[PDB]
């Protein structure tokens, strides 16, 4: 479902608005579809000097898709705070009886001066679901390869090992790399490592990009004559279709691990994460780390991962990017570093070269 | 199901054997599975000089997977004939009370001297289904590309137009051509026609094979410098996985068409076969041809296609090769020439070049 939060100092006047245009209340809203609305009874208790309990707030705010600030009076430090926390966590938001006629019109323009969308209380809702859809994050879909990485007439090389796809088939990352290169009017050349140096010596084109499997990148590292020819791999490309920038930043936090630090493995027969990874993390750091294995369909509760020093998400678990971003965003909001199998495994050997797309 | 025929001059002694180890009789037999057995009551009436009614026989024999010749006495011209018709139609077969003890053992060796498998009457059946499976046609699967067409270090070029496969995908014939080339340690290069001449001038390798769509073969015909570079197309390759030799032979029979000749279209929104084809066939020959459109799941009855001068089967209807061979074999047996959309369409423009695999 979609998560929307309803904050505000007001108690009775807040609960009234919620129930408008029909605790968490799950109800269908057009054109956004199903959504669940949760208010802030824990946050109702206004802090010292009329402030909002920020650390108690960021405990309930972290998992919101978007936000709502329902207000009766003029902006107090409470309304100022809630807004800053939405802005910090990058949670998109909107600001919302007929008392003080024309002042309500003023208030709409008063709350509009702090650079955000203000809608008026009706006791009008056609515009509630309408604005929610417009502030909500969009498609957020990036091209398989880099936007300017491949142009027309460019040779791209795909270097496979021993395909895991059945007889007369190739794995989806490969074919998608052939298609995107073709869509961008470039040339796709697929060849096994064994015959790589031969294609590098017989063709005339210098490869713009070269892609291969994490298994044989080192062999390819030697087959490509220099740092001049940009090499990366099918796992970093797929990892790219998520949040590479955050992940790459988060792997570099492996060094920052001390004894007793908790590293969470998020997956969902003696798998890489349950066993093989921990082993490498301990071997690479020397640290007496402990690991929480979260095998669930959706992202865990705050109580299940609060205090974790790193989150290792599974690579090819195949969710919607937007459903994976929701996960990245939450981790980014809780300040917990998050990466995935692909980036970690690559980090251990040669990740820096795999990073061909600069920030 | 599997079709097996039970022939022989004998009437009561034939019907007895059939009913052994439990008109068409459909029953499960190990290890061949489900099969239907049909005898020859129409053929029971022995012809002039003890002969078999050959033209009446080849009317019921054409659709058999394999054959059975049940006999009581010594080989008469009837037993001689049935055998020759099985041999002609290439229908694989086996030869089958305890009367004339040891003579039955002799008979087994007498019927064995005419170069075929003889099994003895039991009134022993473990060996019936056992032999049927061994004579029955095998896998009959050929490699996607030519067996010796591509070896290691060989460049193969796949030239697409505007893919009919959804976003981030390629059509199955293409990917299977990438895989087979990779399996054979060759190099697959995929590029649009627009950038073809550029790859032909910048790379060092001479392409062993070049594959493309029937739509742009002519453009490629010009982009490939000579007859020295072997060009063909994804449709001829797929047509190859059927009976290319027979098809190619059968298209050349387009010229042999006169006014009144019936051309059958076998398919199963204003499709190519129902309309577009007939139009071309009439335009290319000038002949006043008529067309029977057989839209069925399985191959039609003899009465539905007897007298047809050509059968145009559908190209990408996706059946098992062995289930398509069964169709080719039947047409080959009835002496009706058979081809498919792919071969006809290609015949109209440039099929001869597409034929890179010699007989």
Asked whether residue A176 falls in the same domain as residue A303, the answer is: no
Selected residue of B203, B206, B240 to mutate for chain A interface (largest A Cβ count, 10 A)? B203
Calpha distance B105→B112 (Å, rounded): 11
CB count in 10 Å sphere of residue A162? 9
Cα–Cα separations (whole angstroms), residue A20 to A7, A67, A221, B169: 15, 16, 62, 46
Nearest residue of B to residue A205 by CA position? B202
CB count in 10 Å sphere of residue B253? 14
| Cis ω before B329 (30° cut-off from 0) | no
Query: A245 by DSSP, 3-state: which?
Result: helix
Which CATH number do you get for residue A120? Answer: 3.40.50.300
Asked whether residue B238 falls in the same domain as residue B322, the answer is: no
Calpha distance A172→A174 (Å, rounded): 5
Cβ <8 Å between A192 and B202: no
Distant-in-sequence, close-in-space partners of A132: CB < 8 Å, separation ≥ 6: A4, A29, A32, A35, A66, A94
Q: Does A178 touch chain B (CB under 8 A)?
A: yes
Distant-in-sequence, close-in-space partners of A314: CB < 8 Å, separation ≥ 6: A266, A267, A268, A273, A340, A341
Task: Give the one of A152, A194, A204 whose C-beta lies nearest to B203's C-beta.
Answer: A204
Cβ <8 Å between A175 and B170: yes
Q: Which positions in chain B touch A178 (Cβ < 8 Å)?
A: 170, 178, 190
Asked whether residue B244 falls in the same domain as residue B223, the answer is: yes
CB count in 10 Å sphere of residue A282? 15
Q: Does A204 touch chain B (CB under 8 A)?
A: yes
- Whether the CB-CB separation of B227 and B315 falls below 8 Å is answered with no
Calpha distance B65→B135 (Å, rounded): 10
Which CATH number do you get for residue A344? Answer: 3.40.50.11410
Q: How is A248-267 classified by DSSP, letter by letter?
A: HHHHTTSTT--TT-EEEEE-
CB count in 10 Å sphere of residue B138? 8
What is the number of structural domains in chain A? 3
CB count in 10 Å sphere of residue A290? 12
Calpha distance B33→A341 (Å, rounded): 48
CB count in 10 Å sphere of residue A29? 18
User: Which residue do the tokens 């690991």 mark?
Assistant: A291
CB count in 10 Å sphere of residue A202? 14
User: Which residue do the tokens 């600030």 mark?
Assistant: A69
Q: Does B171 touch chain A (CB under 8 A)?
A: no
Nearest residue of A to residue B161 by CA position? A182
Distant-in-sequence, close-in-space partners of A142: CB < 8 Å, separation ≥ 6: A240, A241, A321
Strands B187-190 and A187-190 turn out to be antiparallel
Residue B145, both tokens = 């590309």
Query: B219 by DSSP, 3-state: which?
Result: helix
Nearest residue of A to residue B173 by CA position? A168
Sheet of A262-266: strands edge to edge? A290-294, A262-266, A310-313, A338-340
Distance from CA of A156 to the nearest CA of B (A): 10
Distant-in-sequence, close-in-space partners of A222: CB < 8 Å, separation ≥ 6: none
Strands A33-39 and A24-29 turn out to be antiparallel
Query: B101 by DSSP, 3-state: which?
Result: coil
Calpha distance B136→B156 (Å, rounded): 36
Query: A190 by DSSP, 3-state: which?
Result: strand
Sheet of A155-159: strands edge to edge? A230-233, A209-212, A155-159, A187-190, B187-190, B155-159, B209-212, B230-233
Boundary-marking domain end, from B254, B269, B294: B254
Nearest residue of A to residue B203 by CA position? A203
Angle subtended at Cα A308 by Cα A305 and Cα A313, rounded to the nearest 5 degrees: 75
Calpha distance A6→A38 (Å, rounded): 6
Asked whether residue B14 falls in the same domain as residue B112, the answer is: yes
Q: How is B225-239 classified by DSSP, letter by letter?
A: -STTSEEEEHHHHHH
Asked whether residue A136 falls in the same domain as residue A6, the answer is: yes
Task: Give the one of A182, A190, A194 whose C-beta lies nearest to B188's C-beta.
Answer: A190
Q: How many CA atoms lie within 13 A of B162 on its CB side?
A: 0
Angle subtended at Cα B142 by Cα B136 and Cα B146, rounded to the nearest 5 degrees: 155
Q: Domain containing B131: what range?
A: 1-145
In this structure, chain B runs to a length of 359
Report the DSSP beta bridge partners of residue A231: A210
Asked whether residue B220 falls in the same domain as residue B96, the answer is: no
A57 alpha-carbon distance from chain centroid: 21
Asked whether residue B179 falls in the same domain as residue B69, the answer is: no
Cβ <8 Å between B185 and A178: no
| Cis ω before A339 (30° cut-off from 0) | no
Boundary-marking domain end, from A200, A229, A254: A254
Asked whether residue B227 falls in the same domain as residue B287, the answer is: no
Asked whether residue A325 falls in the same domain as residue A347, the answer is: yes
Strands A33-39 and A2-7 turn out to be parallel
Q: Which positions in chain B touch A143 (Cβ < 8 Å)?
A: none
Q: Does A294 touch chain B (CB under 8 A)?
A: no
Calpha distance B11→B15 (Å, rounded): 6
Fill in the DSSP letter of residue B275: I
Compute and round to an integer the Cα radius of gyration of chain B: 25
Asked whether residue A229 falls in the same domain as residue A96, the answer is: no
**In sequence order, which ranges of B302-350 are alpha helices (DSSP H)?**
302-305, 321-333, 341-348
Boundary-marking domain end, from A192, A219, A254: A254
> How was it solved?
X-ray
Asked whether residue B265 falls in the same domain as residue B192, the answer is: no
Asked whether residue A200 falls in the same domain as residue A249, the answer is: yes
Nearest residue of A to residue B186 by CA position? A191
Give residue numbers after which chain A breaks (C–N above 2.5 Å): 22, 96, 123, 268
Q: Which positions in chain A touch B202 (Cβ < 8 Å)?
A: 203-205
């Amino acid at each position: 479902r979609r998560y929307i939060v309803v904050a505000g100092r007001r108690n009775v006047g807040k609960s009234s608005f919620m129930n408008a245009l029909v605790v968490y209340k799950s109800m269908e809203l057009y054109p956004v579809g199903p959504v669940t609305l949760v208010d802030t009874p824990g946050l109702d208790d206004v802090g010292e000097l009329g402030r909002l309990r920020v650390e108690k707030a960021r405990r309930v705010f972290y998992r919101a898709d978007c936000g709502i600030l329902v207000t009766d009076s003029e902006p107090t430090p409470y309304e100022d705070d809630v807004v800053n926390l939405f802005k910090e966590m990058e949670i998109p938001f909107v600001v919302v009886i007929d008392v003080l006629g024309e002042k309500a019109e003023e208030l709409k323009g008063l709350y509009e001066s702090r650079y955000e969308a203000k809608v008026l209380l009706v006791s009008g809702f056609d515009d509630i679901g309408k604005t929610i859809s417009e502030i909500l994050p969009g498609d957020e879909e990036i091209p398989y390869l880099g936007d300017l990485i491949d142009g027309g007439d460019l040779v791209i090389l795909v270097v496979p090992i021993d395909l895991g796809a059945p007889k007369g088939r190739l794995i989806m990352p490969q074919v998608h790399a052939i298609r995107e290169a073709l869509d961008r009017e470039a040339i796709a050349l697929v060849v096994k490592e064994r015959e790589l140096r031969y294609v590098m010596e017989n063709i005339g084109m210098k490869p713009k990009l070269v892609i291969t499997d994490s298994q044989v990148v080192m062999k390819v590292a030697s087959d490509v004559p220099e740092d001049v020819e940009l090499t990366t791999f099918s796992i970093v490309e797929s990892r790219y279709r998520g949040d590479l920038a955050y992940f790459v930043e988060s792997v570099r936090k492996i060094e920052e691990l001390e004894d007793g630090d908790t590293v969470v493995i998020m997956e969902g027969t003696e798998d890489i994460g349950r066993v093989k990874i921990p082993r490498w993390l301990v071997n690479h750091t020397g640290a007496q780390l402990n690991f929480k294995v979260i095998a669930g369909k959706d992202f865990p509760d705050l109580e299940e991962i609060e205090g974790a020093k790193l989150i290792i998400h599974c690579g090819g678990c195949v969710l919607n990017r937007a459903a994976m971003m929701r996960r990245v965003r939450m981790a980014k909001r809780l300040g917990i570093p998050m990466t995935n199998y692909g980036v970690t495994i690559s980090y251990l050997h040669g990740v820096l070269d795999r990073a061909i797309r600069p920030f």
